[PDB]
Short mmCIF file of all heavy atoms in Angstrom, two decimals:
data_model
loop_
_atom_site.label_atom_id
_atom_site.label_comp_id
_atom_site.label_asym_id
_atom_site.label_seq_id
_atom_site.Cartn_x
_atom_site.Cartn_y
_atom_site.Cartn_z
N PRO A 1 55.95 -9.11 4.66
CA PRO A 1 57.13 -9.50 5.51
C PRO A 1 57.01 -8.95 6.90
O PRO A 1 56.56 -7.81 7.12
CB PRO A 1 58.25 -8.85 4.70
CG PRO A 1 57.63 -7.69 3.98
CD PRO A 1 56.32 -8.14 3.67
N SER A 2 57.49 -9.77 7.86
CA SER A 2 57.42 -9.41 9.29
C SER A 2 58.74 -9.68 9.90
O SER A 2 59.72 -10.20 9.21
CB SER A 2 56.24 -10.11 10.03
N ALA A 3 58.78 -9.48 11.20
CA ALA A 3 60.10 -9.74 11.97
C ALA A 3 60.37 -11.18 12.01
O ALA A 3 61.52 -11.67 11.84
CB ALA A 3 59.97 -9.17 13.37
N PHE A 4 59.28 -12.02 12.18
CA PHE A 4 59.50 -13.42 12.23
C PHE A 4 59.91 -13.99 10.88
O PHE A 4 60.81 -14.88 10.80
CB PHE A 4 58.21 -14.13 12.74
CG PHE A 4 58.30 -15.68 12.62
CD1 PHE A 4 58.97 -16.46 13.49
CD2 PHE A 4 57.47 -16.36 11.66
CE1 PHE A 4 59.10 -17.85 13.39
CE2 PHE A 4 57.63 -17.67 11.55
CZ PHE A 4 58.36 -18.46 12.46
N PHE A 5 59.28 -13.46 9.74
CA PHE A 5 59.69 -13.88 8.45
C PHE A 5 61.15 -13.54 8.15
O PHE A 5 61.83 -14.28 7.58
CB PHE A 5 58.68 -13.22 7.44
CG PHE A 5 59.28 -13.15 6.05
CD1 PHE A 5 59.31 -14.33 5.27
CD2 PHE A 5 59.74 -11.96 5.53
CE1 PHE A 5 59.78 -14.29 3.91
CE2 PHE A 5 60.25 -11.96 4.19
CZ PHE A 5 60.26 -13.13 3.45
N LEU A 6 61.59 -12.32 8.58
CA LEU A 6 62.93 -11.92 8.35
C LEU A 6 63.90 -12.79 9.10
O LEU A 6 64.95 -13.26 8.51
CB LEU A 6 63.12 -10.40 8.70
N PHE A 7 63.53 -13.11 10.35
CA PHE A 7 64.46 -13.96 11.19
C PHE A 7 64.55 -15.35 10.54
O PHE A 7 65.54 -15.96 10.53
CB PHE A 7 63.87 -14.07 12.57
CG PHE A 7 64.81 -14.72 13.60
CD1 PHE A 7 65.78 -13.98 14.28
CD2 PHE A 7 64.78 -16.03 13.80
CE1 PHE A 7 66.68 -14.52 15.13
CE2 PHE A 7 65.70 -16.63 14.69
CZ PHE A 7 66.58 -15.88 15.34
N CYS A 8 63.34 -15.87 10.02
CA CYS A 8 63.39 -17.18 9.38
C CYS A 8 64.27 -17.13 8.07
O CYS A 8 65.08 -18.01 7.89
CB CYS A 8 61.95 -17.64 9.06
SG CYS A 8 61.81 -19.05 8.12
N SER A 9 64.00 -16.18 7.27
CA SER A 9 64.85 -16.05 6.08
C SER A 9 66.32 -15.82 6.28
O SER A 9 67.09 -16.15 5.44
CB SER A 9 64.27 -14.99 5.19
OG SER A 9 64.39 -13.66 5.83
N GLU A 10 66.66 -15.31 7.45
CA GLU A 10 68.11 -15.04 7.84
C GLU A 10 68.67 -16.26 8.46
O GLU A 10 69.89 -16.41 8.39
CB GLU A 10 68.17 -13.86 8.73
N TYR A 11 67.98 -17.04 9.25
CA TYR A 11 68.54 -18.12 10.00
C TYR A 11 68.16 -19.53 9.52
O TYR A 11 68.38 -20.54 10.22
CB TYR A 11 68.15 -17.99 11.50
CG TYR A 11 68.95 -16.83 12.16
CD1 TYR A 11 68.39 -15.53 12.14
CD2 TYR A 11 70.06 -17.12 12.86
CE1 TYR A 11 69.10 -14.54 12.71
CE2 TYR A 11 70.77 -16.03 13.46
CZ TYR A 11 70.29 -14.76 13.39
OH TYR A 11 70.96 -13.70 13.99
N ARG A 12 67.54 -19.62 8.33
CA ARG A 12 67.25 -20.92 7.70
C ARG A 12 68.55 -21.64 7.44
O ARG A 12 68.57 -22.91 7.63
CB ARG A 12 66.41 -20.71 6.44
N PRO A 13 69.63 -21.02 6.90
CA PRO A 13 70.87 -21.84 6.78
C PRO A 13 71.44 -22.39 8.09
O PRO A 13 72.13 -23.41 8.00
CB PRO A 13 71.84 -20.81 6.12
CG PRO A 13 71.25 -19.50 6.48
CD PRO A 13 69.85 -19.72 6.39
N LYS A 14 71.09 -21.80 9.20
CA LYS A 14 71.49 -22.41 10.53
C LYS A 14 70.89 -23.71 10.71
O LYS A 14 71.53 -24.71 10.99
CB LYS A 14 71.15 -21.40 11.69
N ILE A 15 69.57 -23.84 10.54
CA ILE A 15 68.88 -25.09 10.67
C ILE A 15 69.29 -26.04 9.58
O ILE A 15 69.31 -27.21 9.78
CB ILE A 15 67.36 -24.91 10.73
N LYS A 16 69.68 -25.49 8.42
CA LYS A 16 70.11 -26.33 7.23
C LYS A 16 71.42 -27.05 7.73
O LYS A 16 71.50 -28.25 7.53
CB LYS A 16 70.37 -25.51 6.08
N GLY A 17 72.38 -26.30 8.25
CA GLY A 17 73.63 -26.91 8.67
C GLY A 17 73.39 -27.73 9.92
O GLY A 17 74.20 -28.72 10.13
N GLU A 18 72.42 -27.44 10.71
CA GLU A 18 72.22 -28.29 11.88
C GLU A 18 71.63 -29.65 11.53
O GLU A 18 72.18 -30.68 11.87
CB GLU A 18 71.26 -27.47 12.82
CG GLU A 18 71.07 -28.16 14.22
CD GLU A 18 72.30 -28.29 15.00
OE1 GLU A 18 73.18 -27.44 14.81
OE2 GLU A 18 72.39 -29.16 15.84
N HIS A 19 70.44 -29.65 10.93
CA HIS A 19 69.75 -30.89 10.58
C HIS A 19 69.31 -30.85 9.15
O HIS A 19 68.87 -29.80 8.60
CB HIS A 19 68.55 -31.19 11.45
CG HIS A 19 68.92 -31.58 12.87
ND1 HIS A 19 69.39 -32.82 13.16
CD2 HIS A 19 68.77 -30.90 14.05
CE1 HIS A 19 69.61 -32.90 14.46
NE2 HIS A 19 69.34 -31.75 15.02
N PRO A 20 69.49 -31.90 8.36
CA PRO A 20 69.01 -31.91 7.00
C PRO A 20 67.51 -31.93 6.93
O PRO A 20 66.87 -31.09 6.15
CB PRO A 20 69.63 -33.20 6.37
CG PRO A 20 69.79 -34.13 7.58
CD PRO A 20 70.17 -33.21 8.72
N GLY A 21 66.81 -32.76 7.69
CA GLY A 21 65.33 -32.77 7.61
C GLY A 21 64.76 -33.67 8.68
O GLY A 21 63.59 -34.01 8.64
#
Side-chain angles (χ1 to χ4, degrees), chain A residues 1 3-5 7-9 11 13 17-21:
Chain A
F4 174 73
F5 161 75
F7 192 90
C8 174
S9 60
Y11 289 84
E18 184 66 25
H19 287 286

